[PDB]
């Protein structure tokens, strides 16, 4: 089966240099674009790095541009990510990420488990969850907004919203591709919906299973900017 | 009686009425015709052909040569109608002279990529350079294209004309004792491409009857197209070189002293070097128009 | 050769099937095919072209 | 002797059903078509050139999307092109080269491929491991594979060069239906829109329709005079139309079991290598031997326009389900979209 | 410009395949094809050996040379249906036995092996598809038709041959009706060579003979043909 796993993380004074692996197995690893996204202990999703198939074109997070370095070695399906002079804000959760680009794709399709490192002591799209925090009943209907400061509708009529479910203690995983697009292996009752700058996700008939924190993401324009995180309660 | 200092070089320099009753209507001829052939050609290349492999390309590059060779012909019978007295000024003498080199080295220049090009695609049938792209021709024709300009730009920091008694003098080719690289240049053009044209041309000939392949009749064209450009180039450069280097051996000899024994070699020399010329007239009817696969 | 008889079986019963078919008039198909030309005639880009802005292929 | 009294018995049928179609026949689409207006002159433009095939392409199929292709030639190679894009969104290679037909799921989920090694091979694109494999060779087939038609994920339908249809199952690789009764090598294949019936064009000059549920042949057209190597159904599924060597168009009726008008010029004496329907079946478009299609007034045997711009023989044609455009495929290793 | 990154991303993916699509056709470009054909099981399985169910692939590389040979056997349909697949192949081989020339095909009451070799000759050589496509005509079975050449005359076969029933000229024989069946020799060659059962020198009849049709071919390119 596809699996992702990283490597490499650990305790790290500041100022010093890491480098994260991502072994690759179960997929055409040089098909596939890469990304790197770390999760603070904050809760919050944040987009690093990105690769492309053949190398050809590599994309960094304004925070850590001039400063990390995503590498891929196809050969050996291995990911990289050299890091040096790592801050007290780099102490993160990161997260090798699968993604493929054609007509139908569905991108940030896998995740890896992600591994943990412990850093010792403008013309970005904003998105904003107004909900951080609601409970919700098992069995009944409930929907989670996000907004966008851009309108992510583009020209060619795709409107770029990516939706991904995070279980406690579980990477996050994909929900809608692209602003209704249902992904693989998930129920058929998670739908999105909207337009331009509003939207919406709906699952009805929620269980226990569906508990998480829920976060919007454009692939719009890099950088790619996630949502604050709707977390769902009871 | 003619002796003329050109850039502080002992030499002599010679006004031959015979200049006037030859050259114009040889060049004349060789204009009329090269301009003709070059543009049919350059227009059926243009437009006749809807793509072309590497070989087309350095056919193409020769025929540009050849059209930029004849083009600058009108100017050289306007300086030889009058007795070589030249009325346009400094730049247009330059840019005829290093136009008239330039394009009769990257003509020769191209027959022989073309000569290497045929001998590669008999002899080596199965090697890698018969299956380059248009794009390696591209790269391969600039190359060449700049090595010619390289060799041929010296002619346009020398000062023009020479104005002998008044008259206005635009010639690359004066004879005088001193050493200079536009004579080498000249023998060189000659000699080695001449020696890789006659390799190749021998090797393709005995390779393809060696084979058996001349029984088709299509070959036995082949392989007389070969000897045709072959002999073309052989009669259309050897004679002026011939004089070139009867010239050289009277400088050694005689020198730059009574110089009534060098106006026969320099009038010889002027009539030989109108065949280079009948060479960039002749090459569309030897090359292009002698093609079974050209429209 | 007495294999063929089960061949020469098979294509008579095919035939016999194929005769005992009812058939409407040529008319009537001929119409039926107009009345389908003529009813998806606006909705057919090839025969009626779109304007370039409904054309995805502009 | 069984054998002769046989014979009498097949040519007296054949009689009876050939005055039972004239006796039918009373008027037809001409003598009924022509008080109706023409189609004017019909201009298309290449509004896309699909460039990277390096063969001669010998089919295509549209997507039911409208926007995705596929097309095989002898590279080896299956290009899925996003035609509004001009971009390739897969490149399959075979494992054999001599690829003579190809289709495309209606789910979009797979792509069969077949050809000389008599196999048709079905390919899974959308894959957790996000290549395309091959989800398995189908095999049986004594000929040439030269059509194939899915029916849905499941089930499909290929004709073959052993003069036999057969309808598969993918999900167990068997031969559960095979439709025999053609006399040469079955060269075209066309399904209903119900996906109900299907019609298939052979080289014995014939046009058989087939029931998928009962395989077995309902009617059998003629009248060409050559190998059929194209047929496409008549948008509501009540007609269909050939494409044949001899340089004529027929167009059958199922109801009425007869062909109805020849699609035929005397400039045309090229056979004809790909036949496709309009949307509203109004335009009838052919791929011809002599390198360009020609649009036909299919009520109205009028050649409505010429697809020019191929510098070789046009051997595949697609018109999208919507209907907005058509692409030709062909000899000269280019795929062209034209509106 | 006016791209998504997505859209850009496609982009570079499409860029990727042309590449990949680029390599395949240049490694096949250098590849030599060669359509193998016969009447019936005659000597194309000794032939194949000696270099190296539809269609059939032989790959053999001699003298840094990759060839690719395709085998059309047991394809028992319209031949004019496919035979245009194998128009752009650099030369046919042509493989017959010689020892069938007294043989029935026993499909036809009275048909002759031998005469079936001529019709499949003279179809595939003047086809439409092969005007200068040359062929490379192997003449199998050297030995056991000059041994049994002795017990069976070749008159049986030929009824207008009148010379002597000796291997060499009636080997010659053979070969010049073969050759006479070409209507198209202006533009394309045959090339003839006889093999026994285990005969040795029969890829480098093959190198030489495509490699006469690469210099044609090159020669095509570059105008001189
Ligand atoms: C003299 C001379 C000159 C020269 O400078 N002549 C002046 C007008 C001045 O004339 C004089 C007076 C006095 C003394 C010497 C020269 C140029 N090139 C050559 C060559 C040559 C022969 C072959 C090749 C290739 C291998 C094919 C290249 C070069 C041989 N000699 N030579
Ligand atoms: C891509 C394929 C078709 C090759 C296209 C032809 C190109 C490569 C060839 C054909 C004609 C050539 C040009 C002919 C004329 C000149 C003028 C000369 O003073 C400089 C080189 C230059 C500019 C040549 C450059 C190379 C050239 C442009
Ligand atoms: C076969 C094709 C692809 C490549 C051709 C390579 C050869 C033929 C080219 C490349 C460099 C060229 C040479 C460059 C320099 C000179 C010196 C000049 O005063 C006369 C021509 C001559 C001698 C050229 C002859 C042709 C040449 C040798
Ligand atoms: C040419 O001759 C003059 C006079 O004899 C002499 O001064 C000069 O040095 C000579 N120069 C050459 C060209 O050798
Ligand atoms: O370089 C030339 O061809 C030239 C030089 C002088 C006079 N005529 C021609």
Request: with cysteine.
């Amino acid at each position: 089966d596809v699996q992702l796993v990283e490597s490499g993380g650990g305790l790290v004074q500041p100022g010093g240099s890491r480098k994260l692996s991502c072994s690759a197995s179960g997929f055409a690893f040089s098909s596939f674009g890469m990304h790197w996204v770390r999760q603070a202990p904050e809760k919050g999703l944040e987009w690093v790095a990105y690769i492309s198939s053949g190398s050809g074109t590599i994309y960094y997070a304004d925070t850590v541009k001039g400063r990390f370095t995503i590498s891929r070695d196809d050969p050996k399906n291995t990911l990289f990510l050299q890091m040096t002079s790592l801050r007290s804000e780099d102490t993160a959760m990161y997260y090798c990420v699968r993604s493929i680009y054609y007509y139908g794709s569905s991108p940030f399709d896998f995740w890896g488990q992600g591994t943990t490192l412990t850093v010792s002591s403008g013309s970005d799209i904003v998105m904003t969850q107004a909900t951080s925090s609601v409970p919700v009943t098992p069995g009944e209907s409930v929907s989670i907004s996000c907004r966008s400061s851009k309108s992510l509708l583009h020209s060619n009529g795709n409107t770029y919203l990516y939706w991904f479910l995070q279980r406690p203690g579980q990477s996050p995983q994909l929900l809608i591709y692209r602003m209704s697009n249902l992904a693989s292996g998930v129920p058929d009752r998670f739908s999105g919906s909207g337009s331009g700058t509003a939207f919406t996700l709906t699952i009805s008939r929620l269980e226990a299973e569906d508990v998480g924190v829920y976060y919007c993401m454009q692939h719009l324009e890099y950088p790619l900017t996630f949502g604050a995180g709707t977390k769902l309660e009871l | 009686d003619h002796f003329l200092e050109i850039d502080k070089k002992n030499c002599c320099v010679f006004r031959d009425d015979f200049i006037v009753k030859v050259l114009p209507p040889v060049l004349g001829l060789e204009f009329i015709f090269g301009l003709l052939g070059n543009g049919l050609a350059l227009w059926i290349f243009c437009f006749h052909l809807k793509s072309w492999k590497s070989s087309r390309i350095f056919l193409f590059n020769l025929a540009v040569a050849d059209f930029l060779l004849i083009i600058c012909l009108p100017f050289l019978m306007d300086n030889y109608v009058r007795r070589w007295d030249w009325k346009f000024g400094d730049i247009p003498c330059r840019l005829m002279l290093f136009m008239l080199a330039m394009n009769r080295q990257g003509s020769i220049i191209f027959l022989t990529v073309v000569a290497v090009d045929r001998y590669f695609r008999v002899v080596h049938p199965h090697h890698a350079l018969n299956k380059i792209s248009n794009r390696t021709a591209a790269i391969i024709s600039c190359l060449l294209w700049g090595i010619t300009i390289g060799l041929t730009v010296h002619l346009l920091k020398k000062k023009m004309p020479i104005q002998n008694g008044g008259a206005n003098l635009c010639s690359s080719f004066s004879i005088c004792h001193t050493f200079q690289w536009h004579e080498a240049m000249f023998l060189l053009e000659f000699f080695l491409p001449l020696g890789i044209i006659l390799f190749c041309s021998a090797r393709i000939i005995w390779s393809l009857r060696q084979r058996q392949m001349d029984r088709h009749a299509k070959i036995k064209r082949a392989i007389t197209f070969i000897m045709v450009v072959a002999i073309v180039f052989v009669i259309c450069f050897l004679p002026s070189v011939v004089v070139r280097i009867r010239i050289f051996w009277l400088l050694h000899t005689s020198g730059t002293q009574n110089c009534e024994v060098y106006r026969s070699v320099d009038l010889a020399f002027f009539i030989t070097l109108s065949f280079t010329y009948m060479n960039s007239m002749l090459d569309p009817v030897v090359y292009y128009f002698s093609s079974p696969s050209f429209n | 050769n007495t294999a063929s008889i089960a061949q020469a079986r098979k294509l008579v019963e095919q035939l016999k099937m194929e005769a005992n078919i009812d058939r409407i008039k040529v008319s009537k198909a001929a119409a039926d095919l107009m009345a389908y030309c003529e009813a998806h005639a606006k909705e057919d880009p090839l025969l009626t072209p779109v304007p370039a802005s409904e054309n995805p292929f502009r | 002797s069984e054998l002769d009294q046989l014979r009498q018995e097949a040519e007296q049928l054949k009689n009876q059903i050939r005055d039972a179609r004239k006796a039918c026949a009373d008027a037809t689409l001409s003598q009924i078509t022509n008080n109706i207006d023409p189609v004017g002159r019909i201009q298309m433009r290449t509004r896309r050139t699909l460039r990277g095939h390096l063969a001669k392409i010998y089919a295509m199929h549209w997507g039911t999307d409208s926007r995705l292709l596929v097309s095989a030639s002898q590279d080896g190679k299956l290009i899925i092109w996003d035609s509004y894009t001009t971009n390739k969104v897969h490149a399959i290679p075979l494992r054999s080269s001599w690829v003579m037909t190809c289709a495309y799921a209606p789910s979009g989920n797979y792509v069969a491929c077949g050809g000389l090694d008599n196999i048709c091979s079905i390919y899974n694109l959308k894959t957790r491991e996000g290549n395309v494999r091959v989800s398995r060779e189908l095999a049986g087939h004594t000929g040439y594979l030269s059509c194939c038609r899915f029916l849905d994920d499941n089930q499909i339908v290929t004709s073959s060069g052993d003069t036999t249809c057969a309808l598969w199952d993918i999900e167990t690789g068997q031969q559960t239906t095979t439709f025999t009764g053609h006399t040469g090598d079955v060269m075209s294949l066309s399904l209903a829109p119900d996906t109900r019936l299907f019609v298939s064009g052979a080289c014995d000059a014939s046009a058989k329709l087939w029931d998928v549920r009962e395989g077995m042949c309902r009617q059998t057209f003629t009248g060409h005079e050559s190998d059929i190597n194209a047929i496409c159904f008549f948008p509501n599924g009540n007609a269909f139309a050939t494409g044949s060597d001899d340089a004529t168009c027929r167009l059958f009726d199922l109801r009425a079991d007869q062909e109805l008008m020849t699609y035929s010029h005397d400039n045309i004496i090229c056979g004809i290598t790909s036949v496709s329907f309009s949307k509203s079946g109004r335009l009838l478009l052919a791929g011809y031997d002599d390198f360009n299609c020609n649009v036909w007034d299919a009520l109205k045997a009028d050649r409505a326009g010429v697809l020019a711009g191929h510098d070789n023989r046009v051997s595949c044609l697609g018109v999208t389900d919507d209907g907005m455009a058509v692409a030709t495929g062909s000899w000269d290793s280019f795929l062209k979209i034209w509106n | 410009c006016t791209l998504s990154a997505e859209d850009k991303a496609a982009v570079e993916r499409s860029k990727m395949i042309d590449r990949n699509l680029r390599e395949d056709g240049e490694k096949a470009a250098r590849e030599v094809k060669l359509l193998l054909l016969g009447a019936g099981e005659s000597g194309k399985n000794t032939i194949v050996k000696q270099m190296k169910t539809g269609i059939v692939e032989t790959h053999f590389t001699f003298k840094d040379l990759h060839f690719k040979m395709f085998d059309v056997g047991a394809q028992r349909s319209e031949r004019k249906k496919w035979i245009h697949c194998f128009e752009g192949v650099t030369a046919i081989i042509f493989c017959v036995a010689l020892s069938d020339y007294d043989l029935v095909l026993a499909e036809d009451e009275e048909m002759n092996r031998m005469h079936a070799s001529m019709k499949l000759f003279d179809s595939i050589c003047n086809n439409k598809w092969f005007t200068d496509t040359s062929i490379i005509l192997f003449l199998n079975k050297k030995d056991l038709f000059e041994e049994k050449i002795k017990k069976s005359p070749l008159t049986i076969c030929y009824p207008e041959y009148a010379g002597s029933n000796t291997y060499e000229e009636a080997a010659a024989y053979i070969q010049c009706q073969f050759e006479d069946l070409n209507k198209r020799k202006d533009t394309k060659e045959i090339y003839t060579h006889f093999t026994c059962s285990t005969d040795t020198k029969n890829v480098q009849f093959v190198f030489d003979a495509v490699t006469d049709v690469i210099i044609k071919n090159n020669l095509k390119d570059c105008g001189l043909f």
